[PDB]
């Protein structure tokens, strides 16, 4: 019997299924890029989703249902999430470095100018500005959701969290439409390359963060959170603010300054 407060986790298969899902997704992308086949990739995506679902399911079982998240355990998870976000910041930093490298020193092939000859940027005052208002608004509504939960208010937590998720979905649909309407593509030299890869990874993170908020929504509907203990909600809010801040840097850098 232990007399410390930490969590000895039951032996679990999900690390191995997650690792194999990584093998299948990467060998699957290779097969798709070089051998004209989606089969391995679809298997890998499926086992990846199954792995994430059962792993995070088990974390909910360990915490809400079994009580293993003492304050010491929760404090570790706080550090873990902060450090995870820091690694994601540095991942985006590489794409911003690529963008500033190419745009501050435009080469002769571009016309020696930025934006390149033949590139017609989106107007940053139209849908990009709308998208900025949408994510900023969602950072206000998720803060309302957080204070409602701390104050013990179930209905207004659900309302505010639903508004936050709706805004995340609005951003994603607006961005999808912008991608379709854009007159430039990912193959339009380094302008299209930086634009779509950086905003594309950002859009993927909006989808991830929105999914995480949706998980929190259903956990809230099922009464998992207490007014004092709700780290999954806190982690999703931190991640969501990270997604909002990345967007503000993309807007200022690529859409506005880069136009």
């Amino acid at each position: 019997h232990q007399t410390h407060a930490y969590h000895m986790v039951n032996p679990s298969p999900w690390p191995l299924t997650g690792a194999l899902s990584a093998l299948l997704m990467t060998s699957g992308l290779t097969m798709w890029f070089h051998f004209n086949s989606m089969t391995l990739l679809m298997i890998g995506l499926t086992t990846n989703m199954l792995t994430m679902y059962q792993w995070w399911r088990d974390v909910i079982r360990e915490s809400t249902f079994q009580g293993h998240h003492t304050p010491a355990v929760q404090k570790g998870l706080r550090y873990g999430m902060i450090l995870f976000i820091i690694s994601e910041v540095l991942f985006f930093t590489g794409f911003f470095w690529a963008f500033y490298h190419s745009s501050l020193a435009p080469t002769p092939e571009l016309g020696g100018c930025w934006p390149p000859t033949g590139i017609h940027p989106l107007n940053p005052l139209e849908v990009p500005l709308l998208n900025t208002s949408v994510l900023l608004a969602s950072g206000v509504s998720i803060t309302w959701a957080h204070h409602s939960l701390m104050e013990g208010d179930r209905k207004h937590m659900l309302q505010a969290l639903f508004i936050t998720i709706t805004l995340g979905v609005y951003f994603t649909l607006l961005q999808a439409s912008e991608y379709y309407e854009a007159p430039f593509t990912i193959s339009d030299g380094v302008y299209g390359s930086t634009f779509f890869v950086a905003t594309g990874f950002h859009g993927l993170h909006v989808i991830i963060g929105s999914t995480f908020l949706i998980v929190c929504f259903f956990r809230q509907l099922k009464f998992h959170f207490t007014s004092n203990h709700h780290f999954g909600f806190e982690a999703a809010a931190w991640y969501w603010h990270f997604v909002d801040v990345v967007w503000l840097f993309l807007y200022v850098s690529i859409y506005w300054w880069g136009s």
């Binding site: 232990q2 079994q66 009580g67 293993h68 003492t70 939960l149 009464f223 959170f225 203990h229």
Partner: protein
């Protein structure tokens, strides 16, 4: 506006989380979350080291800000002394 419907930890915490919470209200620390405060450490006033078994490892920071911690098993019975500074420790099983 402000209604309820969110459970509290008092209502819904369970398992080890609930044990820690209830012990903290009593001022008790069965899961070793707090650092114990030293006694004078003499043979007459040894540091009392709780244990659920009949030996426990002690780490002795002999002087404030030493970076070296001195580690040893403390066994049930007569008080033992840190091998570096001599300060006394006595096991109190259960």
């Amino acid at each position: 506006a402000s209604g309820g419907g969110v459970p509290t930890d008092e209502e819904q915490a369970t398992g080890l989380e609930r044990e820690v919470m209830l012990a903290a209200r009593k001022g008790q620390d069965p899961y070793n979350i707090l650092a114990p405060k030293a006694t004078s450490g003499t043979k007459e006033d040894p540091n009392l080291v709780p244990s659920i078994t009949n030996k426990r490892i002690v780490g002795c920071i002999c002087e404030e800000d030493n970076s070296t911690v001195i580690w040893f098993w403390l066994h049930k019975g007569e008080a033992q002394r840190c091998p570096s500074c001599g300060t006394h420790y006595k096991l109190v099983p259960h």
